[PDB]
């Protein structure tokens, strides 16, 4: 075909805090490798760094990446170019309209990857708060990704290797525990795992 194809047709989500850096790097990579992927953040608001630590640029979820881009450009185009935010926002715009909050989505997934335990917990808490009415299993997996541009890309590679492995399973529910441990031993990373239900 014209594109790579996931034989398991997994529906995947990747989740971070602001749906800006880590989840979007993973979104882009996963999509290019042919996966059905969506991305979200778990924070109350979208938060990008500013010119001072105590002066973040904060927006509501739903604010178009394009508008955040314009906002920072007029603030100080050169500063937000050198620190990488304008490129990040540009990459994001090409993927989708705006940052989305996981707790507000109605989409369902076979696998949800989170990029730090705080996000993992919010995702799991949110899933548990919902009365399951289908008994459709979903696997939440946490893979720690350090929050900067370089490590976000590295995380995208690692997360993609993990999803690729699980996609090759013909019965994920009965294989996944063993596959997670194999991945942990080979890649020397801890994966947090929960099985929840829609």
């Amino acid at each position: 075909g014209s594109h790579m194809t996931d034989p398991s047709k997994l529906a995947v989500a990747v989740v971070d805090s602001s749906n800006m850096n880590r989840s979007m790097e993973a979104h882009n990579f996963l999509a290019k490798k042919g996966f059905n992927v969506r991305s979200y953040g778990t924070g109350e608001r979208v938060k990008l760094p500013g010119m001072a630590f105590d002066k973040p640029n904060v927006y509501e979820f739903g604010t178009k990446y394009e508008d955040i881009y314009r906002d920072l450009e007029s603030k100080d185009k050169e500063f937000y170019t050198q620190n990488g935010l304008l490129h990040m926002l540009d990459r994001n715009r090409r993927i989708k309209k705006c940052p989305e909050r996981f707790q507000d989505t109605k989409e369902q997934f076979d696998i949800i990857v989170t990029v730090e335990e705080r996000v993992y917990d919010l995702v799991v808490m949110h899933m548990e708060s919902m009365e399951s009415v289908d008994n459709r299993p979903v696997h939440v997996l946490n893979v720690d990704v350090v929050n900067n541009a370089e490590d976000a890309l590295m995380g995208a590679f690692v997360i993609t290797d993990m999803i690729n492995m699980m996609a090759k399973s013909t019965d994920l529910d009965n294989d996944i525990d063993e596959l997670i441990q194999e991945f942990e031993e080979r890649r020397k990373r801890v994966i947090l795992h929960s099985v929840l239900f829609y």
Partner: peptide, 7 residues
């Protein structure tokens, strides 16, 4: 925490 982290 911001995305990315403040540098």
């Amino acid at each position: 925490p911001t995305s990315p982290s403040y540098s």
